[PDB]
């Protein structure tokens, strides 16, 4: 993807006007610097490889992190899967209106000792379970629940000290592309909710300890990383200016277009 | 000459004598749905003379302290003739449009409009916890107006109409990435845009999804000396192109 | 029992690696594709579209539509300055938040030419001529029309065609330049001066406005992707 190179120019005195155009037509001018001045013939070897859509988006970025405690009833985490609880991955995906990509998940699970009271604690290595529940499946309500059998639900097991786990998810959707914006309602009577939450049904993700609470409580924390692969993007869109406030919608507080300087001639 | 056009659609004609060129979509022309991409199994209805014609919306006055206007336009034509009657009896529907904004002034006035047609414009509410209601988002063939000030957060369900943020929380100067034209009263006199069907599904219900939004924002405001005509109106005519419908049922 | 040997760099999580991973849903059937209009293949055609630049930041015009309007009147002297700003498309707050400056803040290096289109949004009976100069660095900012005529300039005559493109060239010692504010890789200044006056007839308003656009040429390039400094977060959005 090499860029175009400038050609040689000559002093002209003619009736052709490359500099004068008409911007009311909605058409940007296609001039190069060899029309308004004299230029030498250079040849560029610069490539546009890093500004591609695949190189811009296919990088891992965190989306959520949740904690859970070992020696505690109802200590387990859940997360409805959405890509708009962070500030930096949400801004990159909202440069386009429609996207279509495959995923690559990665979990980074840590642990920390809690202030117990038993003398000379000693615990073996911990094993975690991360279950994915598609929209409509039965959900667990406690830790030693029957729903962690995973008869059809895909889950992963991981022992502490190894490499982090990693799966891959294809393009799961009802429509032909993921939609980042939706100007409409859910009900046909145009009541109730309005925005992007109508099309978000990716599913839920559950996390727990497998080992029992031996002698000291242990609080773990799992971070979730998204990585889009094989990305196609349609209908570009201006980048977000105001700060994000909520998750379900695009509400904002008004702000100036730039920061101000003291004059129009100041540098 | 390159300043004259004539658009013929059905039993209606639009002529213009000074104008810029026309802007067609993202490079494509509106066409019908092919057999590779269809998902409905029943036969669609293509009337194509009763619905593909020019419908003229209501006029708005360009004052000196004007901020902007916006239409939605699957909803602006919901009461317009036989286009609004096929929208009620059918469940699905796809269409492309051609939009013609027109505003005339003499050689002694000055101003500049930005005629931009954006897809999927989610508008923000004034209160940060709520979403705006239906009557504040779109009126039937009547413009909703921006403001040059900020709507306070005491209002429950009202659209935030700060014009420099364009209601969507983006810079208003960066709205030129969508298909657009300018109406410069020095040279131009009317703007024309041809838009295809842009959606992530091949067909959509036309009553709970507005897949377009036409914004007219005066960047350089209207100004004239004393003596010239103080009343300058703006008129918008929209014509559907290649419309078809599926799923016939009762009236709704 | 093939004898292997694990190298350093094993069992690490590098966030920019291209590896294969086992799929969670085997034999899944995706939804077939559809010809959606407006497919973008590269980010260098988003930066090649014109966008209005807020030249007029005067501490109360940033929260208004007056930031984009450059005031031009009928003067009583010769050679007055219209505007002026240094050419930094990623650090200077004039070109910072445009369509070009919001892509340059995701990358670190940039190289290429920059177009600057001006539109005269005045009356149809007004005339005038302007000088659109660009001075490479090494000296200061030009303070006269005599100092600014010695650089790369173009003389714009208003008329039927209401736009003029000043295309600044790529004059530098290095192949690339830094996006952030640096003194070693400075780029210069862009100014505007009255060539002749703005002459209007009677009953015509003598105060006209000028819009300015900015884009990139066909030899623009960026490198070394980074994170943007314009977004920030304290807690999760919920």
């Amino acid at each position, epitope marked *: 993807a090499r860029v175009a190179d400038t050609i040689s120019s000559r002093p002209t005195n003619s009736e052709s006007i490359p500099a004068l155009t008409a911007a009311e037509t909605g058409h940007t001018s296609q001039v190069v610097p060899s029309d308004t001045m004299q230029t030498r013939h250079v040849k560029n070897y610069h490539s546009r490889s890093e500004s591609s859509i695949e190189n811009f988006l296919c990088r891992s970025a965190c989306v959520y992190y949740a*904690t859970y*405690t070992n020696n505690s009833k109802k200590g387990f985490a859940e997360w409805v899967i959405n890509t708009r609880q962070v500030a930096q991955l949400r801004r990159k995906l909202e440069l386009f209106t429609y996207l279509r990509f495959d995923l690559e998940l990665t979990f980074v699970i840590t642990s*920390a000792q*809690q*202030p117990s009271t038993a003398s000379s604690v000693d615990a073996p290595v911990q094993t975690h379970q991360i279950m994915y529940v598609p929209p409509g499946g039965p959900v667990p309500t406690k830790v030693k629940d029957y729903a962690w059998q995973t008869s059809t639900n895909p889950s992963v097991f991981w022992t502490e000290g190894n490499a982090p786990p990693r799966m891959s998810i294809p393009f799961i959707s009802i429509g032909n592309a993921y939609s980042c914006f939706y100007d409409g309602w859910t009900q046909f009577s145009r009541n109730g909710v309005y925005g992007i939450n109508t099309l978000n049904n990716m599913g839920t993700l559950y996390m727990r300890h497998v080992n029992e609470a031996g002698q000291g409580p242990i*609080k773990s924390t799992v971070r979730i990383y998204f990585k889009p692969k094989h990305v196609k993007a349609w209908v570009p869109r201006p980048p977000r200016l105001c*700060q*994000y*406030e*909520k998750q379900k919608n695009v*509400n904002f*507080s*008004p*702000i*100036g277009v730039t*920061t*101000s300087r003291t004059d129009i001639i100041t540098t | 000459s390159d300043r004259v056009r004539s658009i013929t659609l059905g039993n209606s004609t639009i002529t213009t004598q000074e104008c810029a060129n026309v802007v067609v979509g993202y490079g494509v022309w509106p066409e019908y749905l092919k057999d590779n991409e269809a998902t409905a199994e029943d036969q669609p209805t293509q009337p194509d003379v009763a619905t593909c014609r020019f419908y003229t919306l209501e006029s708005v006055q360009w004052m000196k302290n004007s901020a902007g206007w916006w239409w939605k336009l699957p909803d602006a034509l919901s009461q317009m003739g036989l286009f609004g009657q096929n929208m009620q009896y059918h469940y699905l529907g796809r269409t492309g449009y051609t939009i013609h904004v027109q505003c005339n002034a003499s050689k002694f006035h000055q101003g500049c409009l930005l005629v931009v047609c954006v897809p999927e414009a989610e508008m923000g509410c004034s*209160n*940060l*916890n709520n979403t705006p209601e239906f009557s504040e988002l779109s009126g039937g063939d009547s413009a909703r107006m921006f403001t040059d*000030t*900020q709507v*306070g*957060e*005491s209002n429950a369900k009202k659209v935030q109409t*700060a014009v420099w943020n364009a209601g969507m929380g983006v810079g208003v100067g960066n709205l030129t990435i969508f298909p657009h034209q300018w109406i410069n009263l020095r040279t131009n006199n009317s703007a024309t845009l041809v838009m295809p069907y842009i959606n992530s599904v091949p067909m959509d219900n036309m009553f709970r999804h507005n897949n377009l939004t036409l914004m007219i924002i005066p960047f350089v405001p209207l100004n004239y000396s004393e003596g010239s005509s103080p009343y300058v109106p703006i008129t918008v005519t929209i014509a559907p192109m290649c419309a078809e419908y599926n799923g016939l049922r009762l009236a709704s | 029992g093939l004898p292997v040997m694990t190298t350093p760099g094993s069992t690490q999580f590098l966030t920019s690696d291209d590896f294969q991973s086992p799929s969670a849903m085997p034999q899944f059937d995706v939804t077939p594709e559809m010809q959606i209009p407006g497919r973008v293949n590269n980010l260098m055609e988003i930066a090649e579209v014109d966008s209005v630049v807020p030249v007029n930041n005067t*501490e*109360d015009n*940033v*929260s208004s539509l007056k930031a984009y309007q450059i005031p031009v009147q009928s003067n009583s002297d010769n050679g007055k300055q219209v505007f002026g700003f240094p050419l930094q498309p990623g650090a200077n707050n004039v070109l910072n938040r445009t369509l070009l400056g919001e892509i340059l803040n995701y990358y670190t290096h940039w190289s290429g030419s920059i177009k600057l289109t001006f539109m005269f949004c005045g009356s149809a009976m007004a005339t005038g001529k302007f000088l659109l100069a660009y001075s490479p660095p090494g000296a200061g900012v030009p303070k006269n029309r005599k100092d600014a005529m010695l650089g790369t300039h173009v003389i714009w005559d208003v008329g039927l065609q209401s736009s003029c493109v000043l295309c600044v060239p790529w004059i530098s010692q290095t192949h690339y330049r830094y996006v952030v504010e640096d003194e070693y890789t400075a780029a210069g200044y862009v100014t505007c001066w009255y060539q002749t006056n703005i002459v209007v007839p009677a009953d015509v308003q003598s105060s006209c406005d000028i819009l300015c656009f900015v884009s990139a040429c066909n030899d623009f390039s960026v490198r070394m992707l980074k994170d943007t400094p314009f977004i*920030r*977060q*304290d*807690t*999760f*959005y*919920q």
Partner: antibody
Amino acid sequence: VQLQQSAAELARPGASVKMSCKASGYTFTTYTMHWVKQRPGQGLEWIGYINPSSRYTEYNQKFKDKTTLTADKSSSTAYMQLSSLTFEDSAVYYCARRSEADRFVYWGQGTLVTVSA
Amino acid sequence: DIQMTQTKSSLSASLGDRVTISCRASQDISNYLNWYQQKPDGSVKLLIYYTSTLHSGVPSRFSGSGSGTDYSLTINSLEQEDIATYFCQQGNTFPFTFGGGTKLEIRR
């Protein structure tokens, strides 16, 4: 990253005071600046906010006719003027920087306002 | 407005005890609650920015619960640096209404 307020004030009944809350460590014209009043016998009480970029202020229904919130861009401070002081205006006033929609993450140390003779 | 009421206003427990502070609303605020902590020298800081989501930089003794109208805040092991005043704040309707104070002390 911190906010610093003024000292403790003292004024006659009917007079006017002007507090301040200098912000540092972040871009001042991005987040809104809120003011919270705490009487010593009650809980916290909201007064209003001000958008420092557009100079738009919005007050509560009780504190509308007394308080006035101003700000400046150069020194990166945010002022607040109380007028027509009565005996129930003797309290502690905090400044807070509003984060995402409904939470305040950074607070001030508060100034003590008293009225007497 | 939404009247955020804490009927406790004073609490007493020994060191190493589990305390519970409850805040009750006027109507359903739909999980939009925040918990703050006011130290006796005047400093206020945010503890839990949801019903149960802990802020960064807060120790893990704190935990929140509740749904609908009734809510709670729990410290499972009371320390010496936790002796402060705790407030609840809703973020559902305009304006923001704070709850009453709740001061903690030692048992005997």
